Amino acid sequence: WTATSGSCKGRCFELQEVGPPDCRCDNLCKSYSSCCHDFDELCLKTARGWECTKDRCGEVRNEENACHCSEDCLSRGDCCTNYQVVCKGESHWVDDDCEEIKVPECPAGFVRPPLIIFSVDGFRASYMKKGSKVMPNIEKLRSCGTHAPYMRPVYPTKTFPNLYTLATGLYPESHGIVGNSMYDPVFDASFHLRGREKFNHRWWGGQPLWITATKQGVRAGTFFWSVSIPHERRILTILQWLSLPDNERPSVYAFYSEQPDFSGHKYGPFGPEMTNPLREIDKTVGQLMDGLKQLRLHRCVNVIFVGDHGMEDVTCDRTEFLSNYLTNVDDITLVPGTLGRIRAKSINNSKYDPKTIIAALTCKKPDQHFKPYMKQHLPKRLHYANNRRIEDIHLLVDRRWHVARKPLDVYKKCFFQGDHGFDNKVNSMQTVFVGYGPTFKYRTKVPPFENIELYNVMCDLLGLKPAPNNGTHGSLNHLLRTNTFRPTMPDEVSRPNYPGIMYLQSEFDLGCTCDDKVENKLEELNKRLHTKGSTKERHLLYGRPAVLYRTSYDILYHTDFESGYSEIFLMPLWTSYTISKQAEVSSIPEHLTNCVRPDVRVSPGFSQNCLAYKNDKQMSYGFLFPPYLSSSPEAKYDAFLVTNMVPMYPAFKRVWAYFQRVLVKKYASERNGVNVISGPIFDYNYDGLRDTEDEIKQYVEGSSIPVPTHYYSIITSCLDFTQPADKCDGPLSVSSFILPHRPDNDESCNSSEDESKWVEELMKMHTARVRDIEHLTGLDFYRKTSRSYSEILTLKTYLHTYESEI
Ligand SMILES: *[C@@H]1O[C@H](CO)[C@@H](O[C@@H]2O[C@H](CO)[C@@H](O[C@@H]3O[C@H](CO[C@H]4O[C@H](CO)[C@@H](O)[C@H](O[C@H]5O[C@H](CO)[C@@H](O)[C@H](O)[C@@H]5O[C@H]5O[C@H](CO)[C@@H](O)[C@H](O)[C@@H]5O)[C@@H]4O)[C@@H](O)[C@H](O[C@H]4O[C@H](CO)[C@@H](O)[C@H](O)[C@@H]4O[C@H]4O[C@H](CO)[C@@H](O)[C@H](O)[C@@H]4O)[C@@H]3O)[C@H](O)[C@H]2NC(C)=O)[C@H](O)[C@H]1NC(C)=O
Ligand SMILES: NS(=O)(=O)C1CCN(C(=O)N2C[C@H]3CN(C(=O)OCc4ccc(OC(F)(F)F)cc4)C[C@@H]3C2)CC1
Ligand SMILES: [Ca+2]
Ligand SMILES: [Ca+2]
Ligand SMILES: [Cl-]
Ligand code: NA
Ligand code: NA
Ligand SMILES: [Zn+2]
User: Fold this and answer.
1) Residues 6+ apart with CB under 8 A from 225
2) β-bridge mates for residue 190, sequence order
3) What contacts 226, CB < 8 A, 6 or more positions away?
4) Backbone angles phi, psi at 765, to 5 degrees
5) Are 624 and 668 within 8 A, CB to CB?
6) What single-letter DSSP state applies at residue 662?
7) Whose CA is nearest to atom 42 of ligand 1?
8) Any idea which ligand is nearest the CA of 611?
9) Are 677 and 714 in contact (CB under 8 A)?
10) Most buried of 243, 443, 528, 610, CB within 10 angstroms?
11) Three-class DSSP category at 548
């Protein structure tokens, strides 16, 4: 109940929300059916429109007008945004030449440069270039300020998940807004785009920027604007708030526009009808900047122009129907569209089986336009699994397509020509970032970056300590003139042991054999040096990774590679090696095919054994440093050490062998040498974080050898490829992956073909940031380079996407 008998007189767009049944006058009351009776009359005035004209100049104040052109309007803070232009011979902000803002130029009483976040829905990255002719205000922000060619949204590339990721710095799986539609089984409650349940606070996790600000004594404007408040009024309201006395005035503000998304759905991302919405957005930016100029704030305020996701061409005729695959179609609930989420229709139905549903959805049709996944098997880069609201069964839909349960859902629910929600690496889903103001750099282009990073920077801009989040604080220091965040490297927690030769061959009873007993102070003194680390400078280019958790491990040196061997998990945490452009690929000699050799530096009790692999009929083994890339016949024996061995399903060995035999050398040829760090990952609870020993669900049969869920590789070289990887004097270049360690290749529909037709495609899908690997392993890489730490943080957040040019 709301007793709408109170009055909005003097309270229009009040910043504090009064508790019902008192009538509200804040910019959210419309959404709650709770505004006072006179809200429209007093607060949403429209008389005379939004612009001054020559004849309105110097007028007698008429409080009925939407905005004002009387002499007192500046001190009242309520002129139309073009007042000084029309009436005082001033120029529009866009017509003024760009001039560097070296320091904030603020009116007295401003404690800090205000931040204004100008967010636009569905603003695809390529609009900056393709619509530049009709967006002069935005183009001036872009060219004069700091801009990225695009900004990567989070998956799914829908509105609420992305705006709330912008606000919190968190992945959707952590903030809880995992789609536009959700069922939470603990609450037994549903979240819907239209409706009231979405307002309940239990949906919204983490700590968004406005709460972070408020708790730290920085006042915030309201972030949410009710749909019926027009854009002009939103701008005028912000400008009025900026005229409040110092003690009442917020330092952070948001504007939101439902365009160009709204039209993009109806007309497609590049429909000719799209020119008008882009023009109108630009005019709104113009009004803000002219309004700030009138208030003398245009060289004081930091402005962020940011989108939530892009827009793709999608029509009704490109819909896959689950009724063309499943017999049991009515026993399931599907969340449909540009992704799919499946669960049982009834929890009382014990005939429901996810395994048979996945199977009936797998590679069933030649050009099938979605791929089914159990959520823990999705690419780790999506970070889309660790939430009870994310259904166990997921469909990744190809760009340009939809999935639906049955045809009736599509024609009884062509209308639309555009949609979004696809994999966040898809070019059409990319969106925009521009930063303009005293705290941003001048005329500066920065590399593309993820929207999870912005919360940290917005906190930096407001002098706030960010709540714990998924950004990597410092990775975006290069956007900022000042207010940078200068992190220290994490402290290493566990120091390695450096074992020498401590065990005789006969102490080992591992059931392993090698044809190696084939026998000189030349190469004998030489091999001792290699085991002591004499080539370590070649194979360990960026220092050894730090171990950020308590564990027991040994550094093992070899001619061709170096490893950090875990005595707890019985295998390396990491293996590091460098392959030059000149390196040659050799095969495994016939006599060495099944050779496995005890490591005399490492006790039998802390070793794997070959008998366990023999007895385990599902599990085979591979090697982290590949025997194919050995530098010499003698060095090759090192690659068969039991300490270089890891458990691998035969299906996965197909993938791994092709990577090691074919792809590493291809990369070294293309990149002028590469340094490779590979290792296992254990993430059985799919939280994107390293498992402890007691979280491991699978071991090699009859043993304490844990089975990795994933294998990673980090591949590093010189950004200036005229320099070899091992002699690089400047910035680095990286690509990484986290491959799921699966006992089948069902993910790859062409896997019956030669690895050359399907393996690289799989690896591209599972591209990763070094940072993702850090989380999954408790390791910290690039500890010893000649590069600044912030530059290394940027490198660690880099994602190689394999998409064409934007
Ligand atoms: C991205 O960044 C984020 C943010 O930094 C990282 O997420 C953090 O990870 C931490 C480690 O997992 C986690 O810490 C746990 O917090 C527990 C208390 O949590 C509450 O309080 C915090 C702080 O205010 C709050 O943020 C939490 O909010 C979560 O849950 C609510 C309600 O469900 C949601 O509204 C909200 O969206 C958020 O949900 C997300 O996180 C939870 C996990 O917390 C998931 O379950 C959800 O799916 C969703 O993703 C909470 O309100 C604390 O109790 C934990 O401590 C347990 O474990 C430690 C182990 O060290 C142990 O010492 C304790 O004894 C305790 O164990 C006991 O509980 C176990 C399970 O009940 C039980 O098995 C044991 O026997 C014991 O009884 C733990 O410290 C932190 O909460 C989240 N924060 C957020 C916001 O998500 C995230 O890791 C990053 N991702 C990547 C890839 O890097
Ligand atoms: N009610 S409805 O019309 O049926 C339905 C309602 C929900 N709707 C719908 O998509 N949204 C209604 C819109 C009003 N919001 C808004 O003002 O957002 C501003 C904002 C948000 C986050 C920000 O994050 C930060 F911190 F800056 F990084 C900043 C600014 C966005 C809402 C999405 C779809 C239509
Ligand atoms: Ca949107
Ligand atoms: Ca884990
Ligand atoms: Cl959704
Ligand atoms: Na086996
Ligand atoms: Na297959
Ligand atoms: Zn949309």
Assistant:
1) 27, 234, 255, 256
2) 183
3) 27, 28, 29, 30, 31
4) -60, -30
5) no
6) I
7) 174
8) 6
9) yes
10) 610
11) coil
Residues contributing to the annotated binding site = 121, 159, 180, 261, 265, 308-309, 420, 683, 685, 687, 689, 691
Site to probe by mutation for ligand 2, drawn from 120, 170, 193, 228 as the one with most ligand atoms within 8 Å of Cβ, is 193
Query: Which residue range(s) make up the domain with 677?
Result: 505-797
Euclidean distance between CA atoms 546 and 277, whole angstroms: 51
At 200 the three-state DSSP class reads coil
| Residue pair 571/483 in contact by the 8 Å Cβ criterion | no
Output the ligand 2 site: residues, CB below 6 A: 117, 119, 159, 163, 166-167, 193-194, 209, 223-225, 227, 254, 256
- 3-state SS, one letter per residue, for 31-52: HHCCECCCHHHHHCCCECCCCC
Ligand nearest to the CA of 687: 4
**What resolution (Å)?**
1.9
Q: Say how far apart CA 726 and CA 675 lie, in whole Å.
A: 8
What is the DSSP code (8-state) at residue 492?
P
- Distance between CA atoms of 286 and 345, rounded to whole angstroms? 50
Experimental method: X-ray
Q: Identify whether the C-beta of residue 559 lies closer than 8 Å to the C-beta of residue 578.
A: no
- Neighbouring residues of 22: CB distance < 8 A, sequence distance ≥ 6: 2, 3, 6
Assess whether the previous peptide bond of 156 is cis (omega < 30° from 0). yes
Residues, CB-to-ion distance under 5 Å, ligand 4: 683, 685, 687, 689, 691
Best CA proximity match to 418, nearest among 261, 260, 265, 270: 265
CATH number at residue 697: 3.40.570.10
* Ligand 1 contact, 778 CB (< 6 A): no
Nearby residues of 128 by Cβ (< 8 Å), 6 or more positions away:
138, 139, 142, 147, 432
Q: Which ligand is nearest to the CA of 420?
A: 8
C-alpha span between 709 and 374 (Å, rounded): 14
Contact 460, 790 (CB under 8 A): no
DSSP class per residue in 47-95: BT-S---GGGTT----TTBSSB-STTHHHHT-B-TTHHHHHS-PPPGGG
DSSP 8-state class, residue 711: E
- Distance (Å) of CA 805 to CA 83, 382, 760, 802: 43, 21, 20, 9
CA distance 720 to 362: 43
